[PDB]
Design an enzyme around this catalytic site. Structure first.
Site, PDB file in Angstrom:
ATOM      1  N   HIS B 558       0.849  -1.198   0.000  1.00  0.00           N
ATOM      2  CA  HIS B 558       0.000   0.000   0.000  1.00  0.00           C
ATOM      3  C   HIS B 558       0.888   1.253   0.000  1.00  0.00           C
ATOM      4  O   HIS B 558       0.619   2.212   0.736  1.00  0.00           O
ATOM      5  CB  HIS B 558      -0.962  -0.017   1.196  1.00  0.00           C
TER       6      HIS B 558
HETATM    7  C1  LIG Z   1       0.490  -8.394  -3.887  1.00  0.00           C
HETATM    8  C2  LIG Z   1      -0.334  -7.148  -3.667  1.00  0.00           C
HETATM    9  C3  LIG Z   1      -1.304  -7.142  -2.662  1.00  0.00           C
HETATM   10  C4  LIG Z   1      -2.080  -6.010  -2.419  1.00  0.00           C
HETATM   11  N1  LIG Z   1      -3.138  -6.114  -1.579  1.00  0.00           N
HETATM   12  C5  LIG Z   1      -4.170  -5.275  -1.730  1.00  0.00           C
HETATM   13  C6  LIG Z   1      -5.452  -5.542  -1.085  1.00  0.00           C
HETATM   14  O1  LIG Z   1      -5.562  -6.556  -0.377  1.00  0.00           O
HETATM   15  N2  LIG Z   1      -6.466  -4.659  -1.279  1.00  0.00           N
HETATM   16  C7  LIG Z   1      -6.336  -3.535  -2.048  1.00  0.00           C
HETATM   17  O2  LIG Z   1      -7.313  -2.759  -2.164  1.00  0.00           O
HETATM   18  N3  LIG Z   1      -5.169  -3.236  -2.676  1.00  0.00           N
HETATM   19  C8  LIG Z   1      -4.087  -4.048  -2.560  1.00  0.00           C
HETATM   20  N4  LIG Z   1      -2.874  -3.754  -3.207  1.00  0.00           N
HETATM   21  C9  LIG Z   1      -2.491  -2.347  -3.290  1.00  0.00           C
HETATM   22  C10 LIG Z   1      -2.911  -1.746  -4.615  1.00  0.00           C
HETATM   23  O3  LIG Z   1      -2.961  -2.741  -5.636  1.00  0.00           O
HETATM   24  C11 LIG Z   1      -1.922  -0.655  -4.977  1.00  0.00           C
HETATM   25  O4  LIG Z   1      -1.852   0.302  -3.911  1.00  0.00           O
HETATM   26  C12 LIG Z   1      -2.382   0.015  -6.253  1.00  0.00           C
HETATM   27  O5  LIG Z   1      -2.472  -0.985  -7.268  1.00  0.00           O
HETATM   28  C13 LIG Z   1      -1.417   1.113  -6.672  1.00  0.00           C
HETATM   29  O6  LIG Z   1      -1.845   1.661  -7.915  1.00  0.00           O
HETATM   30  P1  LIG Z   1      -0.868   2.603  -8.790  1.00  0.00           P
HETATM   31  O7  LIG Z   1      -1.622   3.106 -10.021  1.00  0.00           O
HETATM   32  O8  LIG Z   1      -0.508   3.764  -7.882  1.00  0.00           O
HETATM   33  O9  LIG Z   1       0.499   1.813  -9.231  1.00  0.00           O
HETATM   34  P2  LIG Z   1       0.708   0.224  -9.502  1.00  0.00           P
HETATM   35  O10 LIG Z   1      -0.496  -0.627  -9.209  1.00  0.00           O
HETATM   36  O11 LIG Z   1       1.894  -0.226  -8.687  1.00  0.00           O
HETATM   37  O12 LIG Z   1       0.977   0.003 -11.059  1.00  0.00           O
HETATM   38  C14 LIG Z   1       2.138   0.568 -11.643  1.00  0.00           C
HETATM   39  C15 LIG Z   1       2.306   0.020 -13.050  1.00  0.00           C
HETATM   40  O13 LIG Z   1       3.313   0.783 -13.698  1.00  0.00           O
HETATM   41  C16 LIG Z   1       4.268  -0.076 -14.290  1.00  0.00           C
HETATM   42  N5  LIG Z   1       5.603   0.562 -14.281  1.00  0.00           N
HETATM   43  C17 LIG Z   1       6.452   0.748 -13.259  1.00  0.00           C
HETATM   44  N6  LIG Z   1       7.564   1.395 -13.694  1.00  0.00           N
HETATM   45  C18 LIG Z   1       7.418   1.624 -15.011  1.00  0.00           C
HETATM   46  C19 LIG Z   1       8.190   2.256 -16.100  1.00  0.00           C
HETATM   47  N7  LIG Z   1       9.407   2.804 -15.878  1.00  0.00           N
HETATM   48  N8  LIG Z   1       7.637   2.278 -17.332  1.00  0.00           N
HETATM   49  C20 LIG Z   1       6.427   1.754 -17.603  1.00  0.00           C
HETATM   50  N9  LIG Z   1       5.679   1.169 -16.661  1.00  0.00           N
HETATM   51  C21 LIG Z   1       6.118   1.079 -15.382  1.00  0.00           C
HETATM   52  C22 LIG Z   1       4.195  -1.384 -13.541  1.00  0.00           C
HETATM   53  O14 LIG Z   1       4.544  -2.445 -14.435  1.00  0.00           O
HETATM   54  C23 LIG Z   1       2.752  -1.428 -13.070  1.00  0.00           C
HETATM   55  O15 LIG Z   1       1.901  -2.160 -13.956  1.00  0.00           O
HETATM   56  C24 LIG Z   1      -1.882  -4.775  -3.257  1.00  0.00           C
HETATM   57  C25 LIG Z   1      -0.911  -4.789  -4.273  1.00  0.00           C
HETATM   58  C26 LIG Z   1      -0.131  -5.931  -4.509  1.00  0.00           C
HETATM   59  C27 LIG Z   1       0.911  -5.918  -5.605  1.00  0.00           C
END
Ligand SMILES: Cc1cc2nc3c(=O)[nH]c(=O)nc-3n(C[C@H](O)[C@H](O)[C@H](O)COP(=O)(O)OP(=O)(O)OC[C@H]3O[C@@H](n4cnc5c(N)ncnc54)[C@H](O)[C@@H]3O)c2cc1C
Ligand SMILES: Cc1cc2nc3c(=O)[nH]c(=O)nc-3n(C[C@H](O)[C@H](O)[C@H](O)COP(=O)(O)OP(=O)(O)OC[C@H]3O[C@@H](n4cnc5c(N)ncnc54)[C@H](O)[C@@H]3O)c2cc1C
Lengths: 636, 636, 93
Positions: B558
């Site tokens: 998170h």
């Molecule tokens: C194993 C796990 C368990 C979790 N448990 C829960 C839960 O129980 N309940 C809940 O609600 N949420 C949960 N989450 C938390 C939630 O999924 C994240 O907080 C949320 O997905 C974050 O969203 P985001 O858009 O900020 O970035 P992210 O979801 O981290 O996505 C970032 C994306 O950008 C890409 N990326 C990174 N660097 C680069 C680059 N240089 N160029 C191109 N692409 C790149 C990655 O490949 C990824 O696909 C969990 C996450 C994980 C991985």
């Protein structure tokens, strides 16, 4: 009945379109499809995509194919007699092929150099057949035709592995390489499979069975080998004769049944099947018909000449054991098969069996730098054919999650095969009948590689696709047995399975890691961080790849050009309306009519030729084609 | 394509909302989404909820995650290096997470201290994204959004066991703990799973794939690592440069493709991915960039500072053998795995695999009584932060019906784990690149526990969650091995599996009940009548829990706060519209922007931020957002 | 058969085998299976003609590389460093 209006002879894609469109266009028009192969309606060994491999088995059981062997040993294939199979079933190739959705490039049609066959002209017909069911970022596809096109129930993890590797050598990604404009780039490769039912999109159920379900004016005769087209005093086709498939008549006597045609006879028996029916009807090379005791109806020496194909090489590579492949399904392991058959029946739209496992690939074109290394004889062709044709590719390349080879001749474990083919080969073959008797095998000559320009592109492909293989995550070595005979000391020599991977295959085996024989130079174990460099090759190496090509180059079943549509003094066989010169009321609509090759898997093309010939026959008969077509069975 | 209007970097939920909402507001708007990881479309290892656990395996096979390891060892975690993983797939976290449906409290958003980010301001946007498929007794949830929410196919018997137990220790039942209002209560816990289809509610299928099916303006480049943002003479964002996922080029040599944005460049690469992109583009700490030899574009020292997370502890308990749990499935018992995969295929709406088996839990808050038992340093944080903020919970606690833990270190039998996390840590970290290269690891520092206030609440939780476990029907013991190292004669010391449960495990085993080694203190066998009283704890016991916290505390995935939204002079990085300070046309919309923590599982948070960013880019480009969104594939 | 075998094997024959009638040139035995890595063999059943050269002309050597009893020594099989050895094995095949 004895008499009808139209007769279609051969129920391939082209024939199924013609027969279906016209019948639906006019409930009155009595039209009949006659096919040597069996009826395919609701046969689980047709409508299920995943089992497609089994149709090319020469195992004395399978009869969905006829196998045509080179009459003479070819010098050019270091002594082999090439085998070219083709379909022997309603739907023809559509019922048994690999089911890859590919389209020709815009220039390919332009280069037919005929009125009514421009890209411009056929684009609406191309759309009229398609039911495109996958995302893309262009408007080039049809969305309410009868032929379903989709990404299948399940893409294999290797697809995106292949793409990541293609990118690492600078073949660019694209959402759609079938946009008529592309000849260099790599995609997720679509299939003739209905996204929602997981069923094979075969031309018979789409165009023919759809109509037979709703009307009474479309007659289907199967297991009916069409002997010859009955002619007039004026050389108007009046009818046709057919015999039983099998020659199981008391005495082995010829039992012909005549069917008469008021309006049009259409030959759609395929590149290899059409020019035989013409010939033994009297439409062929005069010297040939004369020698067999066949009264000449029309002296056309080009009938059965200019036999064109795509030339396939299959490069096989061993993969990690946690990779997903078709190998154990293809081996006949009974709980691997029980599982996939069950999956398909329960959830077709997600099923592994709702795919061909050929889920990724590219069209490719050589750089300036690369062109220097290819032949003088290829460089001549480059300038002639490709140089200012930027939308024409030189090679094909796809990845099969599994070996497309006799596993009875492959070691245990998992594999991927780099399925390659030459797009516009210079070489040419021919086919001619040896008898009036419709049961006797003809004369045949592949003509593969009898032009030297066809070597250097394929060689370039081997090297190229191998650089893709080597850069994949799943890669664990080349299958030495099925690769070129490199000098063992050459930096370009093969490396077979690595010791870690071998032990997982046979973990109680007494024999894993016994060096005794030095039959394979082992790969080192897979490292994620490995820094990889291109294989260097010499002239000796190139001579080996060249030899390997001669020895292991194959058909792609993309046969065409044996009843060419060009002017008759240039040896052609048909009009811009596909009528057979020296006759009335006879057309050839199938891939035999093509005057030149198309850089594509040719199911799309055979359908489009079928669509064009349905227009030509519709306006000649004063009919109009109904859109949309009759509902296709089992489709949502 | 070489040029587009919008370029969204990283296909996390926020990125997926942004890319999908904009492309669907205006079909003219050419938007490209670039994603480091693979495409998740119709991947059975993405869309089946019950296999989520595999995505955190460090087994050199799984690649749906990147693993960041603290550069140095932390004194505060008794010398270990914290491992923070994050998503490496399209959909990011949404494709691989625990699929727990949680929402932040109202004050969390209010406490951003920014106009447009009040609870009030965002509540309509909260409802826009949700498709709520479970009962509740409020009007807080949306019912026509893309992301489906439910209690899944089948709740596990331990769910209501846990609630009965929570009730007995004075945590009250509620229909809905996700009502922005609740800080002390216990519910059946919902999941990002479609009630009807049994599929995971991933951001990519909902927002992006939905769109790409019906329009041609949304472009998708997966397996592509965004290196840097290209800048104008006036710090306007002109485009983006990406490299392949794998560094598998000839001679490991760098290969950048460039893609230009007319209107906007959005960053959604995550809390860990985003700052890195800014820093190698020349946007970060002025000194750090100087030393790495990157031309400064905007000196923002707080790029990659204020890394916040939720701090997980995992309390494992043994349970009866007649209990239903995920353990045998997680171990790989083929006919357990075959029974569950098959059940999901035939009837997903009631399948065990249409779940995450985290089927109940609570948000909790300490009494006046309990506060005294905590530290001086936590009582300080209590007054400063929680005292007049009663809608904030201190700790989250849930039951996994199974052992979320390496089963290779677990005895046989059945388990449940108490999954606990710290809702608002005081402790803080940072991330900075080490090179201009995008392939190199950055300098990293979790920061877990570097603030001593963070211990007491976690210690408090262990005690509280233990009292729940002990009051359950399924409870048969504490797993001594994975519990704090209490003095063996301490009344708080663990009691492990009882003999009757142990004999059940191995009924023909020669070794069960051999006292030799005195490795465990067995429980007394289960009594349904057993009167129960709290475990007392001494100061020594508390030290043993503190040390156990230091030893076994982890990320909860998170992660937030590394491109924070506050005034630049407070070390902020973005505007109240999410514009990067000192630039033009550049926005971070992901969880990086959060100035403070949220009492929630942050998938909800990332989506909302995405919905908000879509509004901010929509009014800046004079677009209007469409409700409802494009119909999501396979949904009813 | 001696004519097929070339000048450098005939020089050995005259020198070594000619008036030595109890000396065989090649050994040969059927193994009832493959004696080879089955990891590199197709499925099915196999036999191997196990063959060896009785009295090779070729010579090798082995010397140590260090006083330490754990370091690998220099080695040279020396197989086929005498062309006379090729012909009888060829005749065995
Ligand atoms: C194993 C796990 C368990 C979790 N448990 C829960 C839960 O129980 N309940 C809940 O609600 N949420 C949960 N989450 C938390 C939630 O999924 C994240 O907080 C949320 O997905 C974050 O969203 P985001 O858009 O900020 O970035 P992210 O979801 O981290 O996505 C970032 C994306 O950008 C890409 N990326 C990174 N660097 C680069 C680059 N240089 N160029 C191109 N692409 C790149 C990655 O490949 C990824 O696909 C969990 C996450 C994980 C991985
Ligand atoms: C195994 C295989 C794999 C292929 N790979 C691909 C691929 O990956 N992708 C793709 O798009 N396409 C593929 N195709 C190519 C495609 O299927 C063909 O181009 C197409 O089917 C040819 O159409 P046609 O109408 O010209 O002839 P055909 O499809 O060959 O049909 C001719 C029909 O006429 C019948 N016939 C022949 N002689 C007589 C007679 N005397 N009397 C009555 N009937 C007769 C035959 O039984 C046959 O059914 C492949 C083909 C095969 C066989």
């Amino acid at each position: 009945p004895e008499e009808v209006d139209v007769i279609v002879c051969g129920g391939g894609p082209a024939g199924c379109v013609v027969a279906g469109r016209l019948a639906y266009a006019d409930p009155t028009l009595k039209v009949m499809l006659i096919e040597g192969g069996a009826n395919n309606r609701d046969d689980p060994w047709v409508y299920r995509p995943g089992i497609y491999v089994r149709n090319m088995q020469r195992n004395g059981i399978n009869d969905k194919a006829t196998f045509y062997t080179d009459t003479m040993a070819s010098s050019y294939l270091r002594g082999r007699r090439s085998i070219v199979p083709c379909a022997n079933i309603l739907g023809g190739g559509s019922s048994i092929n690999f089911q890859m959705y590919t389209r020709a490039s815009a220039s390919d049609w332009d280069d037919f150099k005929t009125e009514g066959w421009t890209c411009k002209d056929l684009l609406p017909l191309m759309k009229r057949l398609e039911n495109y069911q996958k995302p893309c970022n262009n408007d080039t596809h049809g969305y309410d035709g009868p032929i379903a096109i989709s990404n299948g129930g399940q893409i294999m993890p290797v697809a995106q592995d292949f793409l990541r590797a293609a990118h690492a050598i600078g073949v660019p990604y694209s959402d759609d390489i079938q946009d008529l404009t592309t000849a260099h780039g790599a995609e997720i490769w679509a299939k003739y499979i209905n996204r929602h039912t997981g069923r094979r999109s075969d031309a018979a159920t789409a165009y023919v069975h759809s109509v037979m379900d709703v009307q009474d004016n479309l007659f289907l005769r199967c297991n009916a080998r069409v002997s010859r087209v009955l002619f007039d005093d004026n050389n108007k086709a009046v009818g046709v004769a057919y015999v039983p498939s099998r020659n199981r008549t008391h005495g082995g006597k010829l039992h012909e049944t005549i069917v008469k045609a008021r309006k049009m006879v259409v030959l759609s028996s395929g590149t290899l099947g059409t020019p035989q029916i013409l010939e033994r009807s009297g439409v062929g090379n005069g010297e040939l018909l004369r020698q067999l005791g066949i009264k000449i109806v029309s002296d056309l020496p080009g009938v059965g000449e200019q036999y064109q194909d795509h030339y396939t090489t299959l490069s096989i590579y061993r993969v990690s054991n946690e990779s997903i492949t078709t190998d154990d399904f293809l081996r006949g392991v009974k709980d691997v098969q029980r599982e996939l058959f069950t999956e398909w029946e329960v959830s077709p739209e997600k099923a592994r069996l709702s795919s061909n496992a050929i889920d990724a690939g590219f069209k490719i074109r050589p750089t300036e730098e690369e062109l220097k290394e290819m032949g003088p004889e290829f460089n001549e062709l480059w300038n002639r054919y490709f140089k200012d044709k930027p939308d024409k590719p030189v090679m094909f390349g796809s990845i099969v999650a599994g070996a497309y080879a006799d596993h009875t001749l492959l070691p245990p474990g998992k594999y991927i095969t780099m399925f390659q083919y030459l797009e516009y080969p210079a070489s040419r073959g021919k086919i001619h009948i040896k008898s009036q008797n419709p049961y006797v095998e003809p004369f045949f000559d592949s003509g593969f590689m009898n032009n030297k320009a066809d070597f250097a592109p394929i060689r370039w492909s081997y090297k190229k696709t191998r650089e893709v293989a080597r850069r994949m995550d799943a890669f664990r070595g080349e299958l030495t047995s099925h690769h070129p005979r490199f000098h063992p000391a050459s930096p370009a020599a093969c490396k077979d399975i690595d010791i870690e991977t071998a032990k997982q295959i046979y973990p109680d085996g007494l024999t894993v890691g016994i060096h005794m024989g030095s039959w394979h130079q082992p790969s080192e174990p897979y490292k994620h961080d490995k820094v990889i460099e291109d294989i260097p090759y010499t002239e000796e190496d190139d001579k080996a790849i060249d030899d390997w090509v001669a020895d292991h180059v194959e058909t792609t079943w993309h046969s065409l050009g044996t009843c060419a549509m060009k002017p008759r003094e240039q040896g052609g066989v048909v009009d811009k309306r596909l009528n057979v010169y020296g006759t009335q009321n006879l057309k050839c609509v199938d891939l035999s009519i093509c005057p030149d090759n198309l850089g594509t898997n040719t199911y799309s093309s055979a359908l489009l030729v079928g669509e064009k010939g349905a227009d030509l026959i519709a306006e000649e008969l004063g009919l109009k084609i109904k859109t949309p077509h009759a509902p296709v069975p089992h489709a949502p």
